[PDB]
Amino acid sequence: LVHVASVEKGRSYEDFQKVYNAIALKLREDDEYDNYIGYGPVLVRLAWHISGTWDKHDNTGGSYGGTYRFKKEFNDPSNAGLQNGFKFLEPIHKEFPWISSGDLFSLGGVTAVQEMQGPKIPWRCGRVDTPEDTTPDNGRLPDADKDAGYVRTFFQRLNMNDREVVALMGAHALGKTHLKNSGYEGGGANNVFTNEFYLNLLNEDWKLEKNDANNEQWDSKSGYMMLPTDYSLIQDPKYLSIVKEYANDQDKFFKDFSKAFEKLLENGITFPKDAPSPFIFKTLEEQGL
Ligand code: HEM
Ligand SMILES: c1ccc2[nH]cnc2c1
Ligand SMILES: c1ccc2[nH]cnc2c1
Protein backbone atom coordinates (compact mmCIF):
# COMPACT_ATOMS: atom_id res chain seq x y z
CA LEU A 1 0.00 0.00 0.00
CA VAL A 2 1.57 3.24 -1.19
CA HIS A 3 0.37 6.80 -0.40
CA VAL A 4 2.07 9.34 -2.62
CA ALA A 5 1.91 13.00 -1.55
CA SER A 6 0.39 15.27 -4.21
CA VAL A 7 0.57 19.09 -3.77
CA GLU A 8 -2.84 20.78 -3.87
CA LYS A 9 -2.95 22.15 -7.43
CA GLY A 10 -0.89 25.37 -7.84
CA ARG A 11 -0.41 25.92 -4.09
CA SER A 12 2.83 27.14 -2.56
CA TYR A 13 4.21 28.32 0.81
CA GLU A 14 2.14 31.49 0.78
CA ASP A 15 -1.11 29.62 0.50
CA PHE A 16 -0.28 27.43 3.50
CA GLN A 17 0.97 30.32 5.65
CA LYS A 18 -2.47 31.92 5.06
CA VAL A 19 -4.18 28.82 6.47
CA TYR A 20 -1.68 28.76 9.40
CA ASN A 21 -2.54 32.39 10.09
CA ALA A 22 -6.32 31.75 10.00
CA ILE A 23 -5.94 28.91 12.54
CA ALA A 24 -3.58 30.99 14.71
CA LEU A 25 -5.87 34.02 14.71
CA LYS A 26 -8.87 31.85 15.67
CA LEU A 27 -6.82 30.29 18.51
CA ARG A 28 -6.17 33.77 19.83
CA GLU A 29 -9.84 34.88 19.50
CA ASP A 30 -11.71 31.86 20.78
CA ASP A 31 -9.91 31.92 24.10
CA GLU A 32 -12.63 30.82 26.49
CA TYR A 33 -12.81 27.16 25.63
CA ASP A 34 -12.19 24.65 28.41
CA ASN A 35 -11.95 27.22 31.18
CA TYR A 36 -9.66 29.55 29.27
CA ILE A 37 -7.23 26.91 28.18
CA GLY A 38 -8.21 27.59 24.56
CA TYR A 39 -8.14 25.13 21.67
CA GLY A 40 -4.37 24.63 21.39
CA PRO A 41 -4.12 21.38 23.33
CA VAL A 42 -7.15 19.67 21.75
CA LEU A 43 -5.71 20.49 18.27
CA VAL A 44 -2.39 18.87 19.24
CA ARG A 45 -4.30 15.80 20.40
CA LEU A 46 -6.38 15.71 17.20
CA ALA A 47 -3.18 15.78 15.04
CA TRP A 48 -1.76 12.90 17.07
CA HIS A 49 -4.94 10.76 17.00
CA ILE A 50 -5.35 11.06 13.23
CA SER A 51 -1.68 10.02 12.82
CA GLY A 52 -1.56 7.41 15.63
CA THR A 53 -3.79 4.90 13.75
CA TRP A 54 -0.85 4.08 11.44
CA ASP A 55 0.48 0.54 11.23
CA LYS A 56 4.02 0.17 9.85
CA HIS A 57 3.33 -3.44 8.84
CA ASP A 58 0.77 -2.77 6.10
CA ASN A 59 0.83 1.07 5.82
CA THR A 60 -2.84 1.39 6.83
CA GLY A 61 -4.11 4.36 8.83
CA GLY A 62 -1.99 7.46 9.47
CA SER A 63 -2.66 11.08 8.57
CA TYR A 64 -2.63 10.78 4.79
CA GLY A 65 -6.26 9.99 4.06
CA GLY A 66 -8.00 12.41 6.45
CA THR A 67 -10.30 9.52 7.50
CA TYR A 68 -11.28 11.11 10.86
CA ARG A 69 -14.00 12.97 8.85
CA PHE A 70 -15.88 9.60 8.51
CA LYS A 71 -18.33 8.36 11.15
CA LYS A 72 -16.45 5.18 12.17
CA GLU A 73 -13.28 7.03 13.14
CA PHE A 74 -15.01 10.25 14.36
CA ASN A 75 -17.04 8.05 16.81
CA ASP A 76 -14.11 5.93 18.04
CA PRO A 77 -14.43 6.07 21.89
CA SER A 78 -10.66 6.79 21.96
CA ASN A 79 -11.45 10.03 20.11
CA ALA A 80 -14.05 11.34 22.58
CA GLY A 81 -13.73 15.08 22.93
CA LEU A 82 -11.87 15.67 19.63
CA GLN A 83 -15.18 16.74 18.04
CA ASN A 84 -14.42 20.12 19.64
CA GLY A 85 -11.19 20.41 17.55
CA PHE A 86 -13.09 19.34 14.40
CA LYS A 87 -15.71 22.06 14.99
CA PHE A 88 -12.97 24.63 15.52
CA LEU A 89 -11.42 23.76 12.10
CA GLU A 90 -14.71 23.58 10.20
CA PRO A 91 -14.91 27.35 9.35
CA ILE A 92 -11.32 27.29 8.29
CA HIS A 93 -11.95 24.47 5.84
CA LYS A 94 -14.91 26.51 4.52
CA GLU A 95 -12.60 29.50 3.89
CA PHE A 96 -9.88 27.31 2.26
CA PRO A 97 -11.75 24.46 0.68
CA TRP A 98 -8.76 23.43 -1.48
CA ILE A 99 -6.77 22.08 1.47
CA SER A 100 -7.06 18.31 2.03
CA SER A 101 -8.46 17.05 5.35
CA GLY A 102 -5.21 15.36 6.43
CA ASP A 103 -3.26 18.51 5.62
CA LEU A 104 -5.67 20.64 7.62
CA PHE A 105 -5.76 18.31 10.65
CA SER A 106 -1.97 17.98 10.75
CA LEU A 107 -1.40 21.69 10.14
CA GLY A 108 -3.76 22.43 13.06
CA GLY A 109 -1.35 20.51 15.33
CA VAL A 110 1.74 22.32 14.04
CA THR A 111 0.05 25.74 14.35
CA ALA A 112 -1.08 24.99 17.96
CA VAL A 113 2.42 23.87 19.09
CA GLN A 114 4.07 26.96 17.61
CA GLU A 115 1.43 29.42 18.82
CA MET A 116 1.80 27.96 22.36
CA GLN A 117 5.54 28.99 22.16
CA GLY A 118 6.74 25.51 21.27
CA PRO A 119 9.43 24.64 18.79
CA LYS A 120 9.12 25.15 15.07
CA ILE A 121 7.78 21.98 13.42
CA PRO A 122 8.61 21.62 9.70
CA TRP A 123 5.55 20.53 7.81
CA ARG A 124 4.95 19.04 4.37
CA CYS A 125 1.79 19.30 2.30
CA GLY A 126 0.19 16.83 -0.08
CA ARG A 127 -1.96 14.45 1.93
CA VAL A 128 -4.93 13.32 -0.24
CA ASP A 129 -8.41 12.49 0.97
CA THR A 130 -9.15 8.79 0.57
CA PRO A 131 -12.58 7.11 0.54
CA GLU A 132 -14.68 5.88 3.45
CA ASP A 133 -13.57 2.28 3.06
CA THR A 134 -10.01 3.22 3.94
CA THR A 135 -11.00 4.29 7.43
CA PRO A 136 -9.16 2.17 10.00
CA ASP A 137 -11.19 0.20 12.53
CA ASN A 138 -11.43 1.46 16.10
CA GLY A 139 -8.97 0.18 18.73
CA ARG A 140 -5.60 1.30 17.24
CA LEU A 141 -5.03 4.14 19.77
CA PRO A 142 -3.44 3.37 23.16
CA ASP A 143 -4.96 2.61 26.58
CA ALA A 144 -3.91 4.77 29.56
CA ASP A 145 -4.20 2.15 32.35
CA LYS A 146 -1.07 0.18 31.35
CA ASP A 147 2.65 -0.01 32.08
CA ALA A 148 5.96 0.79 30.42
CA GLY A 149 6.17 -2.55 28.52
CA TYR A 150 2.76 -1.80 26.97
CA VAL A 151 3.82 1.77 25.97
CA ARG A 152 7.07 0.49 24.42
CA THR A 153 5.36 -2.32 22.45
CA PHE A 154 2.47 -0.07 21.33
CA PHE A 155 4.82 2.56 19.90
CA GLN A 156 6.90 -0.02 17.95
CA ARG A 157 3.80 -0.21 15.65
CA LEU A 158 4.39 3.45 14.83
CA ASN A 159 8.17 2.86 14.34
CA MET A 160 8.96 5.04 17.43
CA ASN A 161 11.94 4.24 19.68
CA ASP A 162 12.37 5.02 23.38
CA ARG A 163 13.66 8.55 22.90
CA GLU A 164 10.87 9.39 20.39
CA VAL A 165 8.24 8.04 22.79
CA VAL A 166 9.54 10.01 25.79
CA ALA A 167 9.78 13.23 23.72
CA LEU A 168 6.25 12.81 22.27
CA MET A 169 4.78 12.20 25.76
CA GLY A 170 6.02 15.71 26.78
CA ALA A 171 2.86 17.01 25.05
CA HIS A 172 1.07 15.98 28.25
CA ALA A 173 2.33 19.27 29.67
CA LEU A 174 -0.64 20.69 27.66
CA GLY A 175 -4.32 20.78 28.49
CA LYS A 176 -6.02 18.28 30.75
CA THR A 177 -8.00 15.08 31.02
CA HIS A 178 -11.79 15.25 31.26
CA LEU A 179 -13.73 12.61 33.20
CA LYS A 180 -16.50 12.43 30.64
CA ASN A 181 -14.14 11.85 27.73
CA SER A 182 -11.62 9.38 29.06
CA GLY A 183 -12.46 8.42 32.64
CA TYR A 184 -9.54 10.51 34.12
CA GLU A 185 -10.08 13.51 36.35
CA GLY A 186 -8.10 16.47 35.15
CA GLY A 187 -5.69 18.45 37.26
CA GLY A 188 -3.86 21.75 36.91
CA ALA A 189 -3.63 22.80 33.31
CA ASN A 190 -1.55 24.88 31.04
CA ASN A 191 -1.41 26.14 27.51
CA VAL A 192 2.24 27.05 27.10
CA PHE A 193 4.59 24.45 25.62
CA THR A 194 7.44 23.73 28.09
CA ASN A 195 9.36 20.74 29.45
CA GLU A 196 7.27 20.90 32.67
CA PHE A 197 5.85 17.36 32.22
CA TYR A 198 9.35 15.90 32.99
CA LEU A 199 9.98 18.28 35.92
CA ASN A 200 6.59 17.38 37.43
CA LEU A 201 7.20 13.66 37.07
CA LEU A 202 10.53 13.90 38.93
CA ASN A 203 9.71 16.54 41.51
CA GLU A 204 6.15 15.95 42.72
CA ASP A 205 5.07 13.57 45.48
CA TRP A 206 2.68 11.28 43.57
CA LYS A 207 -0.13 9.37 45.28
CA LEU A 208 -2.08 6.52 43.64
CA GLU A 209 -5.76 7.39 43.94
CA LYS A 210 -9.06 6.19 42.50
CA ASN A 211 -11.20 8.72 40.65
CA ASP A 212 -15.03 9.00 40.23
CA ALA A 213 -14.97 6.71 37.14
CA ASN A 214 -13.28 3.96 39.28
CA ASN A 215 -9.94 4.34 37.48
CA GLU A 216 -6.60 4.73 39.16
CA GLN A 217 -4.43 7.77 38.53
CA TRP A 218 -1.49 9.51 40.15
CA ASP A 219 -2.26 12.76 41.94
CA SER A 220 -0.14 15.32 43.72
CA LYS A 221 -0.97 17.74 46.47
CA SER A 222 -0.15 20.61 44.15
CA GLY A 223 -3.10 19.49 42.17
CA TYR A 224 -1.41 17.84 39.21
CA MET A 225 -2.14 14.38 37.84
CA MET A 226 -0.44 11.71 35.77
CA LEU A 227 -1.96 8.77 33.88
CA PRO A 228 -0.54 5.29 34.68
CA THR A 229 1.15 5.39 31.24
CA ASP A 230 2.73 8.78 32.11
CA TYR A 231 4.02 7.48 35.45
CA SER A 232 5.47 4.39 33.71
CA LEU A 233 8.17 6.67 32.28
CA ILE A 234 9.79 6.87 35.70
CA GLN A 235 9.33 3.17 36.54
CA ASP A 236 11.37 1.89 33.54
CA PRO A 237 15.13 2.50 33.75
CA LYS A 238 15.54 3.37 30.04
CA TYR A 239 12.70 5.83 30.00
CA LEU A 240 13.78 7.38 33.31
CA SER A 241 17.26 8.30 31.89
CA ILE A 242 15.57 10.23 29.03
CA VAL A 243 13.02 11.89 31.38
CA LYS A 244 16.02 13.21 33.39
CA GLU A 245 17.71 14.44 30.20
CA TYR A 246 14.66 16.51 29.11
CA ALA A 247 14.05 17.83 32.64
CA ASN A 248 17.57 19.25 32.49
CA ASP A 249 17.73 20.51 28.91
CA GLN A 250 14.76 22.46 27.54
CA ASP A 251 16.40 23.00 24.11
CA LYS A 252 17.15 19.31 23.62
CA PHE A 253 13.61 18.43 24.46
CA PHE A 254 12.30 21.04 21.91
CA LYS A 255 14.57 19.72 19.15
CA ASP A 256 13.71 16.04 19.81
CA PHE A 257 9.97 16.76 20.04
CA SER A 258 9.99 18.66 16.77
CA LYS A 259 11.65 15.73 14.94
CA ALA A 260 9.42 13.06 16.52
CA PHE A 261 6.17 15.05 15.94
CA GLU A 262 7.04 15.71 12.28
CA LYS A 263 7.79 12.00 11.83
CA LEU A 264 4.49 11.03 13.50
CA LEU A 265 2.58 13.35 11.11
CA GLU A 266 4.46 11.99 8.04
CA ASN A 267 4.43 8.25 8.76
CA GLY A 268 2.99 6.27 5.82
CA ILE A 269 3.55 9.04 3.22
CA THR A 270 5.86 8.76 0.24
CA PHE A 271 7.21 12.13 -0.89
CA PRO A 272 8.39 12.23 -4.52
CA LYS A 273 11.86 13.47 -5.14
CA ASP A 274 10.62 16.65 -6.70
CA ALA A 275 8.24 17.40 -3.84
CA PRO A 276 8.74 20.82 -2.21
CA SER A 277 10.95 21.04 0.88
CA PRO A 278 9.17 21.14 4.26
CA PHE A 279 7.76 24.51 5.18
CA ILE A 280 8.60 26.36 8.38
CA PHE A 281 5.76 28.74 9.21
CA LYS A 282 6.22 32.07 10.90
CA THR A 283 4.21 32.60 14.06
CA LEU A 284 1.77 35.53 14.38
CA GLU A 285 4.25 37.10 16.78
CA GLU A 286 7.08 36.83 14.18
CA GLN A 287 4.81 38.51 11.60
CA GLY A 288 3.74 41.40 13.91
CA LEU A 289 0.10 40.17 13.67
C1 HEM B 1 0.53 6.15 25.62
C2 HEM B 1 0.14 7.13 24.83
C3 HEM B 1 -0.89 8.09 25.25
C4 HEM B 1 -1.99 7.92 26.05
C5 HEM B 1 -2.45 6.65 26.71
C6 HEM B 1 -2.66 9.17 26.13
C7 HEM B 1 -3.84 9.34 26.87
C8 HEM B 1 -4.46 10.58 26.99
C9 HEM B 1 -5.69 10.79 27.64
C10 HEM B 1 -6.53 9.73 28.30
C11 HEM B 1 -5.98 12.11 27.57
C12 HEM B 1 -7.20 12.80 28.14
C13 HEM B 1 -8.31 13.00 27.10
C14 HEM B 1 -9.54 13.66 27.70
O1 HEM B 1 -10.08 13.18 28.70
O2 HEM B 1 -9.99 14.67 27.16
C15 HEM B 1 -4.91 12.73 26.86
C16 HEM B 1 -4.85 14.08 26.62
C17 HEM B 1 -3.91 14.61 25.75
N1 HEM B 1 -2.93 13.96 25.07
FE1 HEM B 1 -2.51 12.10 25.21
N2 HEM B 1 -1.98 10.07 25.41
C18 HEM B 1 -0.90 9.52 24.85
C19 HEM B 1 0.07 10.07 24.04
C20 HEM B 1 0.00 11.37 23.57
C21 HEM B 1 0.82 11.91 22.56
C22 HEM B 1 1.88 11.14 21.82
C23 HEM B 1 0.44 13.24 22.39
C24 HEM B 1 0.97 14.24 21.44
C25 HEM B 1 2.16 14.17 20.86
C26 HEM B 1 -0.61 13.50 23.30
C27 HEM B 1 -1.22 14.71 23.47
C28 HEM B 1 -2.28 14.88 24.35
C29 HEM B 1 -2.88 16.21 24.58
C30 HEM B 1 -2.43 17.51 23.95
C31 HEM B 1 -3.89 16.05 25.46
C32 HEM B 1 -4.81 17.13 26.01
C33 HEM B 1 -6.13 17.26 25.26
C34 HEM B 1 -7.03 18.35 25.81
O3 HEM B 1 -6.63 19.16 26.65
O4 HEM B 1 -8.19 18.43 25.40
N3 HEM B 1 -0.84 12.34 23.98
N4 HEM B 1 -4.00 11.77 26.51
C1 LIG C 1 -12.47 20.28 9.40
C2 LIG C 1 -13.86 20.33 9.52
C3 LIG C 1 -14.64 19.73 8.54
C4 LIG C 1 -14.06 19.04 7.44
N1 LIG C 1 -14.60 18.36 6.36
C5 LIG C 1 -13.57 17.90 5.60
N2 LIG C 1 -12.41 18.27 6.18
C6 LIG C 1 -12.70 18.99 7.33
C7 LIG C 1 -11.89 19.62 8.31
C1 LIG D 1 -3.15 14.51 29.39
C2 LIG D 1 -3.23 15.90 29.63
C3 LIG D 1 -2.54 16.56 30.65
C4 LIG D 1 -1.77 15.71 31.51
N1 LIG D 1 -0.97 16.04 32.60
C5 LIG D 1 -0.38 14.89 33.01
N2 LIG D 1 -0.81 13.86 32.24
C6 LIG D 1 -1.70 14.34 31.31
C7 LIG D 1 -2.37 13.70 30.23
Curated annotation (Swiss-Prot):
Domain of life of the native organism: Eukaryota
Catalytic reactions of this protein: 2 Fe(II)-[cytochrome c] + H2O2 + 2 H(+) = 2 Fe(III)-[cytochrome c] + 2 H2O
Organism: Saccharomyces cerevisiae (strain ATCC 204508 / S288c) (Baker's yeast)
Record's comment on post-translational modification: CCP1 precursor is processed by the rhomboid protease PCP1, which cleaves the N-terminal hydrophobic transit peptide. The m-AAA protease (composed of YTA12/RCA1 and YTA10/AFG3) is required for CCP1 maturation: m-AAA protease promotes membrane dislocation of the CCP1 transmembrane segment within the transit peptide to ensure the correct positioning of CCP1 within the membrane bilayer, allowing intramembrane cleavage by PCP1.
Cofactor-binding details, from the entry: Binds 1 heme b (iron(II)-protoporphyrin IX) group per subunit.
Entry's family note: Belongs to the peroxidase family. Cytochrome c peroxidase subfamily.
Subcellular location: Mitochondrion matrix; Mitochondrion intermembrane space
Keyword Mitochondrion appears in the UniProt entry: yes
Gene: CCP1
Record protein name field: Cytochrome c peroxidase, mitochondrial
Span within the parent record: 71 to 361 of 361
GO biological process: cellular response to oxidative stress; hydrogen peroxide catabolic process; response to reactive oxygen species
GO MF terms held by the record: cytochrome-c peroxidase activity; heme binding; metal ion binding; peroxidase activity
Keyword entries, A-Z: Heme, Hydrogen peroxide, Iron, Metal-binding, Mitochondrion, Organic radical, Oxidoreductase, Peroxidase, Phosphoprotein, Transit peptide
